[PDB]
Amino acid sequence: DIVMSQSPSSLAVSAGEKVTMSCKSSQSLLNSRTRKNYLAWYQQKPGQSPKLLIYWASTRESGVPDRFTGSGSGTDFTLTITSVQAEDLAVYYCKQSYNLRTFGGGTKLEIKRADAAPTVSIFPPSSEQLTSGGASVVCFLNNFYPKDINVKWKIDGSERQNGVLNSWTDQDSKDSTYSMSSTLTLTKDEYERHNSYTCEATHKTSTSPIVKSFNRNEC
Amino acid sequence: EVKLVESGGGLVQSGGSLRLSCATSGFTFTDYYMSWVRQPPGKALEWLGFIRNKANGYTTEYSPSVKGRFTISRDNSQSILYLQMNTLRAEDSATYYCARDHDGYYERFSYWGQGTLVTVSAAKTTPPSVYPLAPGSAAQTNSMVTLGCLVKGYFPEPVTVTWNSGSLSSGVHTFPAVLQSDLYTLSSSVTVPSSTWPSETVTCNVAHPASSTKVDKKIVPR
Ligand SMILES: C=CCO[C@]1(C(=O)O)C[C@@H](O)[C@@H](O)[C@@H]([C@H](O)CO[C@]2(C(=O)O)C[C@@H](O)[C@@H](O)[C@@H]([C@H](O)CO)O2)O1
Ligand SMILES: [Mg+2]
Ligand SMILES: [Zn+2]
16 A cells, blocks of 8 residues: 555645645655655646646646646655646646556645636527426626626526536646536426526626526517 | 456335446456446445356355345356346445456456446336527627527436537536436537538537437537
8 A cells, every 4th residue: 555645635726936845655655676656647637537637746748838847755756847838737647657556635726827707608598498398597707807796687686596507627738718508397287477587797807796697488 | 458348227116126237348357356336326446246256166145235136247258257146235336447457466456437327216217308498689799609408307327429520529517417206407508610600510419328318419500
């Protein structure tokens, strides 16, 4: 049993700045015979498979940008990223191969950027859903930062909280923003009892909520 | 080009068995140890086991977490790696990756497959309903226009969504599925110049492998 531990669990760094993260092993990974530390680093970008960055603690794999440097020895190892780029958003894992293999628990790197307001769009239920007796209303809140955001649904001017589900994307690898979807699902019978459907987004970028609405009579 | 492609993932009941495969090309297969690694949704990688290269007699080793229950094997004539899993439980639900491992010298996993997702559950396979998301009575004259597709009520994961067969990749956001009442729902938005829709077609392409569902949904104004 070789226990691998990483720190921090997560952090956010602005483009251009330095990133430092740590990996500890419960026993030395320095192989006596070869005089090398059997410790590798992997980068896993959102939605992708892990990719090899560094092995033998400090050897940078071909094709990996030189801003990535592995260091350390024995029980303590460090991955340093200089001049971090938006595309470096990922979970970083260390892995020992001294005795079988074991991964650390990962360090999640987020990218800090300037606050950005969401672009909000609303969509009424499709006729192909209504035909089956259901009515989902969808709101997209796209390209905002930071991740914290509030969405309220109002139906004929009254807030409704039940039947609402939200889902955030991972941070974008190009512009470092988030997006979120909010979907309000009703029955057709209830949908047909009301006219105005509104999604309201409140984000730190404005004291004014962004309001998008449609009226059933206008469909 | 080195390629590793896993197959065999899907829905299986607790207590059941499932065998995964990993087809490889672009390197001398027998020269390499091969590993399996898994990852529960949103959690860490976990090394499962390896099978050694020809020089080391193709012998196997396993993590204590699966030793006695999972078996690794390899077809050295076709360059395919296998993982047999038995007595599956919910904790085994994960993306399974094959990885190229040691060649007798280098200490690294050089290459990884795309992964195959295994779901251990008693719930039944349900294909998605796919609904178009077109603007209602909005201005539309807002320079850009955002369209979407709602992929509702399916099980198990995953689904794939593309737009115009992958030709539209910029300005696409596919929102992670959320589970409710034993069913997943996700949505995908795409943002394009208003000068291109509806004058040009925009179609979402949805697949749900568990039900072999293939859907192409044209977003039509209305
Ligand atoms: C006993 C020395 C043998 O060294 C070699 C060899 O000359 O055949 C070369 C090593 O690189 C290594 O392959 C070993 C042996 O096969 C062990 O390799 C493993 C293993 O358990 O199979 C795998 C390696 O990744 C590494 O973990 C080593 C460990 O450093 C012990 O040697 O074990 O054979
Ligand atoms: Mg975006
Ligand atoms: Zn052994």
